Design an enzyme around this catalytic site. Sequence first.
Site, PDB file in Angstrom:
ATOM      1  N   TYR A 215       9.479  22.309   4.570  1.00  0.00           N
ATOM      2  CA  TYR A 215       9.925  22.948   3.416  1.00  0.00           C
ATOM      3  C   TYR A 215      10.602  24.262   3.876  1.00  0.00           C
ATOM      4  CZ  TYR A 215       6.081  20.375   1.369  1.00  0.00           C
ATOM      5  OH  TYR A 215       5.390  19.243   1.054  1.00  0.00           O
TER       6      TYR A 215
ATOM      7  N   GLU B 239       6.565  12.643  -6.153  1.00  0.00           N
ATOM      8  CA  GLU B 239       5.467  11.444  -5.916  1.00  0.00           C
ATOM      9  C   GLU B 239       5.038  10.772  -7.176  1.00  0.00           C
ATOM     10  OE1 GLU B 239       4.856  14.545  -4.865  1.00  0.00           O
ATOM     11  OE2 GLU B 239       4.851  14.482  -2.812  1.00  0.00           O
TER      12      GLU B 239
ATOM     13  N   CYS C 246      10.699  18.732  -5.325  1.00  0.00           N
ATOM     14  CA  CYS C 246      11.309  19.397  -3.950  1.00  0.00           C
ATOM     15  C   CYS C 246      12.912  18.713  -3.993  1.00  0.00           C
ATOM     16  CB  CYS C 246      10.942  18.332  -2.767  1.00  0.00           C
ATOM     17  SG  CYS C 246       9.179  19.173  -2.408  1.00  0.00           S
TER      18      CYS C 246
ATOM     19  N   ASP D  59      14.633  29.993  -6.973  1.00  0.00           N
ATOM     20  CA  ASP D  59      15.186  29.819  -8.247  1.00  0.00           C
ATOM     21  C   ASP D  59      16.681  30.162  -8.339  1.00  0.00           C
ATOM     22  OD1 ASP D  59      12.088  30.866  -9.835  1.00  0.00           O
ATOM     23  OD2 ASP D  59      12.590  28.974  -9.349  1.00  0.00           O
TER      24      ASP D  59
ATOM     25  N   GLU E 275       0.805  -1.277  -0.095  1.00  0.00           N
ATOM     26  CA  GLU E 275       0.083  -0.086  -0.030  1.00  0.00           C
ATOM     27  C   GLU E 275       0.854   1.052  -0.031  1.00  0.00           C
ATOM     28  OE1 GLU E 275      -3.204  -0.758   3.098  1.00  0.00           O
ATOM     29  OE2 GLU E 275      -4.319  -0.660   1.297  1.00  0.00           O
TER      30      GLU E 275
ATOM     31  N   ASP F 279       8.015   7.191  -4.497  1.00  0.00           N
ATOM     32  CA  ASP F 279       8.752   8.482  -5.043  1.00  0.00           C
ATOM     33  C   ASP F 279       9.673   8.316  -6.006  1.00  0.00           C
ATOM     34  OD1 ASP F 279       7.246  10.103  -3.296  1.00  0.00           O
ATOM     35  OD2 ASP F 279       8.893  11.124  -2.403  1.00  0.00           O
TER      36      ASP F 279
ATOM     37  N   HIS G 233      11.385  10.887   3.245  1.00  0.00           N
ATOM     38  CA  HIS G 233      11.958  10.715   1.909  1.00  0.00           C
ATOM     39  C   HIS G 233      12.964  11.799   1.811  1.00  0.00           C
ATOM     40  CE1 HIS G 233       9.211   7.504  -0.331  1.00  0.00           C
ATOM     41  NE2 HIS G 233       8.645   7.840   0.904  1.00  0.00           N
TER      42      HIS G 233
ATOM     43  N   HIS H 293      10.621  28.574  -7.872  1.00  0.00           N
ATOM     44  CA  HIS H 293       9.701  27.462  -8.226  1.00  0.00           C
ATOM     45  C   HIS H 293      10.250  26.128  -8.085  1.00  0.00           C
ATOM     46  CE1 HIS H 293       8.898  30.827 -10.859  1.00  0.00           C
ATOM     47  NE2 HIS H 293       7.492  30.156 -10.936  1.00  0.00           N
TER      48      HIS H 293
HETATM   49  O1  5RP Z   1       7.648  11.914  -0.075  1.00  0.00           O
HETATM   50  C1  5RP Z   1       7.142  12.635   0.026  1.00  0.00           C
HETATM   51  C2  5RP Z   1       6.016  12.444   1.368  1.00  0.00           C
HETATM   52  O2  5RP Z   1       5.257  11.392   0.866  1.00  0.00           O
HETATM   53  C3  5RP Z   1       7.408  14.063  -0.358  1.00  0.00           C
HETATM   54  O3  5RP Z   1       8.029  13.845  -1.273  1.00  0.00           O
HETATM   55  C4  5RP Z   1       7.877  14.989   0.867  1.00  0.00           C
HETATM   56  O4  5RP Z   1       8.175  16.306   0.249  1.00  0.00           O
HETATM   57  C5  5RP Z   1       9.001  14.625   1.446  1.00  0.00           C
HETATM   58  O5  5RP Z   1       8.831  13.608   2.214  1.00  0.00           O
HETATM   59  P1  5RP Z   1       8.895  13.276   3.754  1.00  0.00           P
HETATM   60  O6  5RP Z   1       8.017  14.321   4.638  1.00  0.00           O
HETATM   61  O7  5RP Z   1       8.670  11.844   3.903  1.00  0.00           O
HETATM   62  O8  5RP Z   1      10.530  13.677   3.888  1.00  0.00           O
END
Ligand code: 5RP
Lengths: 195, 195
Positions: free
Chosen positions: B79, B158, B57, B84, B28, B32, B137, B120
């Site tokens: 984040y 993703e 990202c 850019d 399930e 990425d 990730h 961006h």
């Molecule tokens: O894969 C993800 C969450 O499913 C996204 O790419 C996210 O930007 C980064 O992942 P994480 O919060 O696991 O570091």
Amino acid sequence: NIFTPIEEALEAYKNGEFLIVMDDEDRENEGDLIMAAELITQEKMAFLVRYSSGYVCVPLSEERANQLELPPMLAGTAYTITCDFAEGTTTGISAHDRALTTRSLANPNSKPQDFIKPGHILPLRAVPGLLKKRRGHTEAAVQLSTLAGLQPAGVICELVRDEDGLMMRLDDCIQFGKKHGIKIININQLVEYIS
Amino acid sequence: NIFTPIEEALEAYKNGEFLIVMDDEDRENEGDLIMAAELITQEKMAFLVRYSSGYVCVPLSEERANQLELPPMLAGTAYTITCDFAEGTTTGISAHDRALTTRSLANPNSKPQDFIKPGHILPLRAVPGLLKKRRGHTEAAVQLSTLAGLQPAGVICELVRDEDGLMMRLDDCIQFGKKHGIKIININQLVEYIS
Ligand SMILES: O=C(CO)[C@H](O)[C@H](O)COP(=O)(O)O
Ligand SMILES: O=C(CO)[C@H](O)[C@H](O)COP(=O)(O)O
């Protein structure tokens, strides 16, 4: 024989269709899909993401962004802090979640505390006066929604070619509109109408 | 017969291939695409955008993000303010521009003033200790780059289904890997290797 008259475009927009929006008539212009924020469904978001850069933005008026406590990301495209609508979202990035967040940003009953920041939608602050003050796609989206009698909120993304990822210029946008039954307008057209 | 051994995966990564990265072995899990930030080309960015959410990202270590003056967007995915790379970009959103910005974030010679904010690309701050401290990730991307002897910077997005925009779970990721010749690993696998 390329661009749809504005009043016809507005009816399409009112009925939850995308419009393909160019700056003016130039063949070198790159096209954006734009539709009303309050009308975007899971399926329409899936469509938008499928054929675009996926950097999905939600134009709002400054007044509405102020109400929702979405300040400029910093203190040019006017990005706010990103967000997700909390209730009914999980990953935030899914078509379902992005659509829900977008509809929620338009919903006049939404409150600042209903959103998680940062998130997976990029709200944009349209300048007061809209297209009479700045001829941006941000202002175009809010203008279209306003002219359609809808909430002053839109949702936008840049069309991209499947073949090579290059942004779709006019010829490809015309082809895309024909293939998918989506009308095309340009910002100069919209300015002329409101002026 | 599903997951590639880590040392083989690292060689692929070193040679500028994507890896499909899952959390663990669960069917399930959603996949990425991840590759080294310094190696992403226009064409590879076009590929990433084409088959993903497009919310692209760029995981960086906190130390590197600090060096580049990319503070958290606010003061969960970490984040930073978006950006850019200024020189050689126009629209910022194009495959070319997003790739250039991503490579620039990895480049140890890049300076804070070389970037325009907002932008961006979405840089992410990986926690010190990487996968031993947070199994995200973000941490996986920086870990892979580190293990590959590359700059501690990755680029991720993703995978999404063409049919309906739903995120690709394991079965679809296996199909995608077979179709495109991309190896699949999982984070549990990576943790086991480094531990
Ligand atoms: O894969 C993800 C969450 O499913 C996204 O790419 C996210 O930007 C980064 O992942 P994480 O919060 O696991 O570091
Ligand atoms: O269309 C665009 C720029 O080409 C982007 O969608 C941007 O997010 C908003 O555009 P603008 O800066 O023109 O309001």
